[PDB]
């Protein structure tokens, strides 16, 4: 049993994950695979945590999910240097994600979500 907001967040989530076919951003970055990551990135974020926040109804607006998505890409652009494949994939993912999470699309969903309340 999910609210219209939760289901809209999951559809956007699945569309965002299709822009990351390499699964670079599907799971948290550990210190084991990236030394000093916990000491450099103060607010780590990844697709798995965002999906967990959706299922626990932690997200309030699509904008909050969009803020986490921006944080996810910018984190990779701080820890990784501009030549790295992680930096370049994060830059491309962020740009694609901003078109998906555009104010135009966030709006069509806000109306449909609202129309599913108050009968
Ligand atoms: C959690 O798992 C993975 C994380 C990364 C990964 C991501 N980001 C954003 C980074 O900045 C990063 C920085 N240094 C080293 C690694 C990463 C890469 C993976 O493989 C290439 C896997 C493993 N498979 C799921 C694909």
Distance 87 CA to ligand 1 centre (A): 11
Kindly tell me the sign of the dihedral angle through the C-alpha atoms of 24, 30, 35, 41.
positive
Distance 65 CA to ligand 1 centre (A): 21
Distance 12 CA to ligand 1 centre (A): 22
Q: Would you tell me how many other CB atoms lie within 10 Å of the CB of residue 8?
A: 22
28, 31, 32, 33: which to mutate for ligand 1, most atoms within 8 A of CB?
A: 33
25, burial (CB in 10 Å: exposed 0-12, middle 13-18, buried 19+): buried
107, burial (CB in 10 Å: exposed 0-12, middle 13-18, buried 19+): exposed
Q: Which ligand 1 atom is at minimum distance from the Cα of 79? A: 11
Please, which experimental method was used? Answer: X-ray
Domain count, the chain: 1
**In the chain, count of helices (H) and strands (E)?**
6, 0
Contact 17, 71 (CB under 8 A): no
- Residues with Cβ within 6 A of ligand 1? 23-27, 29, 33-34, 76, 79-80, 86
Alpha-carbon span 38 to 40, nearest angstrom = 6
DSSP string of 55-97? HTT---SHHHHHHHHHHHHHHHHHHS-TTSHHHHHHHHHHHHH
CATH number of the CATH domain containing 106: 1.20.920.10
Buried-exposed string 44-65: b where 16+ CB fall within 10 A, e elsewhere: bbbbeebbebbeeeebeebeeb
Alpha-carbon span 84 to 18, nearest angstrom = 21
Range of the domain at 109: 1-119
């Amino acid at each position: 049993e999910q609210t219209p907001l939760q289901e809209a967040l999951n559809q956007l989530m699945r569309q965002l994950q299709r822009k990351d076919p390499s699964a670079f951003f599907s799971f948290p970055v550990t210190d084991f695979i990236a030394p000093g990551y916990s000491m450099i990135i103060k607010h780590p974020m990844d697709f798995s945590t965002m999906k967990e926040k959706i299922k626990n109804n932690d997200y309030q607006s699509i904008e909050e999910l969009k803020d986490n998505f921006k944080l996810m890409c910018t984190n990779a652009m701080i820890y990784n240097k501009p030549e790295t494949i992680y930096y370049k994939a994060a830059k491309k993912l962020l740009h694609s994600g901003m078109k998906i999470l555009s104010q135009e699309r966030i709006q069509s969903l806000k109306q449909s979500i609202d129309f599913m309340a108050d009968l």
